[PDB]
Write a protein that binds this ligand. Structure first.
Ligand code: HEM
Ligand code: HEM
Ligand code: HNI
Ligand code: HNI
Lengths: 141, 146, 141, 146
């Protein structure tokens, strides 16, 4: 469960990210594809060339969904309901990959938020991304 | 990696009693029932809407035959699983785009099917040997991903 | 979430297990220790070899907890609250090990219930054990 | 894992700029803060009651440095990580009773700590190389478990 302190840390950290969210989402995806090449098996229909506009566009979508989840951190299951439907019925990404993207999002945040990425904020962000992942896989079976 | 000679004999002895075609269809079917997101790879196989639709699906059964056939062949090469499955690894990556996590899921469903078929004969030590095998096969099928 | 059919399946299968619950719990543990030696790191104070009085005793505890979960299948977070406290604050088993034990419980049930362990029931039991595992790791952080 | 010659160079170059005292303390500390159940292994280290207490704990800092020293030694053995960590593998298994899943968690945290320190210098290709390294080290430390 996300504590009130977790929510404070997540809102403060993502607030700092601000308009950079889309960029950071794309960076996290790039980091994921390079570090964990098995994740590319979900994007064979994508242009995965360096600096891919299609990947950047997807980074924006992922980031926007996260921004929405932060804005509705008290009720993420309802906020992400349509997205969770899509993941369960269409995308059907194996649950193990959500941890890989979450880690790459953390790495991206760490690389861009030198002052804000304290041990406590790190912990809260990890719980948050795990919670989002849980919602997105909640309807799988 | 690292089966004991006693475990290799145990694996071989049990497998001699396995109907590979039958067990293959059953294992692939149960994969698609127990972890239904894995159906994402088999849209062309037709009706997968119920457990019975999946388990009795002729294309699922057929595919299960060739899958466990390759598995069966690999049991003759337990000291070189990575080499044995290298071309299938490359195919599943480059052509089929199958997340290798699926190989792990299939491995454990297969173990459940073996337990179901053999009952008490599928003893804890025999299971342990087969867990080494399915981990080795999954790791081998994952090895050429890039 | 467990469906109506899931709960019917779990109650029927575990009901069939019946008086064997403790035996099967111990067998599942033995299967886990042999198949996944890293799980033995949580029991350095145990005799883990076949015919262990400690493993038999612990199997009974695990089985009885599952029987209680089945009896309260619509309220497992609360029915298992004391146990989840213990796991979070004392036992502190890494979540991956719950998947290993769950798998070994399925193998044990398959080995003993030829007629009952259908594909649908297999699916339901796996969901059930995953849900129990989620409750037991829910308070870790 | 198999690093390319280009990745081996990238790993070594970045590591030459690593402050082991800081990164080691930060990595072990954050393991204990972000995954607090791992504190089960370090009760003898004393006060781990708050994040500040963990990060400032002299024993956490000293041990983190020692852990990173072993990591550094591994970086000079990249073609044989299993061999070089064989002794430490047996130790963590038989004497320390540490679930190897924890090695992956520490690797996670270490990569985050490197990213935190190096910022944009910790490029996606550099990260990818270090992910190969931490997976390799974790796998090597897990290899002799039994
Ligand atoms: C023991 C593990 C496995 C083995 C040995 C294996 C082996 C094979 C073989 C021999 C083929 C035929 C290759 C060809 O068409 O040239 C194949 C095809 C295929 N496999 Fe695998 N397989 C395994 C697991 C899986 C799993 C777990 C999945 C997905 C859940 C999967 C997905 C596919 C697909 C989609 C095809 C192509 C099917 C088609 O023709 O439409 N495989 N596999
Ligand atoms: C992943 C890379 C790791 C490396 C390279 C490493 C290395 C080491 C080394 C060099 C020692 C000292 C050995 C000695 O005293 O002779 C040690 C001790 C120890 N390690 Fe690790 N370790 C790693 C991960 C972990 C993790 C993830 C945990 C637990 C979550 C852990 C638990 C311990 C414990 C409890 C000790 C003994 C501490 C004490 O003296 O009280 N290690 N490790
Ligand atoms: C490794 C695979 C993978 C992971 C871990 C993952 C994890 C996540 C997470 C976790 C924090 C979030 C918030 C998220 C958000 C989204 N994903 Ni993800 N997705 C993944 C692979 C996809 C794929 C594939 C698509 C379809 C893309 C396309 O355009 O075809 C997708 C589509 C989306 C969309 C677009 C939905 C739509 O079109 O209506 C959003 C938003 N996502 N994905
Ligand atoms: C691999 C490790 C591991 C796993 C996966 C696991 C998974 C589970 C599951 C999953 C479905 C259940 C229902 C369960 C139930 C229990 N465990 Ni588990 N436990 C594990 C390691 C332990 C350990 C260790 C103890 C303490 C045993 C002892 O006697 O010291 C324990 C103790 C218990 C007890 C006794 C509590 C008490 O003393 O009050 C129950 C009940 N459990 N454990």
């Amino acid at each position: 469960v996300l504590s009130p302190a977790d929510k404070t840390n997540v809102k403060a950290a993502w607030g700092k990210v601000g308009a950079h969210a889309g960029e950071y989402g794309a960076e996290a995806l790039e980091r994921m594809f390079l570090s964990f090449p098995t994740t590319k098996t979900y994007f064979p229909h994508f242009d995965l060339s360096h600096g891919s506009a299609q990947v950047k566009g997807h980074g924006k979508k992922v980031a926007d969904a996260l921004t929405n989840a932060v804005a509705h951190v008290d009720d993420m299951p309802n906020a992400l309901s349509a997205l969770s439907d899509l993941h369960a019925h269409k995308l059907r990404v194996d649950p193990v990959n959500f941890k890989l993207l979450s880690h790459c999002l953390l790495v991206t945040l760490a690389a861009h938020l030198p002052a804000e990425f304290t041990p406590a904020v790190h912990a809260s962000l990890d719980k948050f991304l795990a919670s989002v992942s849980t919602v997105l896989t909640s309807k799988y079976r | 990696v690292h089966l004991t000679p006693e475990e290799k004999s145990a694996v071989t002895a049990l497998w001699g009693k396995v109907n590979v075609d039958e067990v293959g269809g059953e294992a692939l079917g149960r994969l698609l029932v127990v972890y239904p997101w894995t159906q994402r790879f088999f849209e062309s196989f037709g009706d997968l809407s119920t457990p019975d639709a999946v388990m009795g699906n002729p294309k699922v059964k057929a595919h299960g035959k060739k899958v466990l056939g390759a598995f069966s062949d690999g049991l003759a090469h337990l000291d070189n699983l990575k080499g044995t499955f290298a071309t299938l690894s490359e195919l599943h990556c480059d052509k089929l785009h199958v997340d290798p996590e699926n190989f792990r899921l299939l491995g454990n469903v297969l173990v459940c099917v073996l337990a179901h078929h053999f009952g008490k004969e599928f003893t804890p030590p025999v299971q342990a040997a087969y867990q080494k095998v399915v981990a080795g096969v999954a790791n081998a099928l994952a090895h050429k991903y890039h």
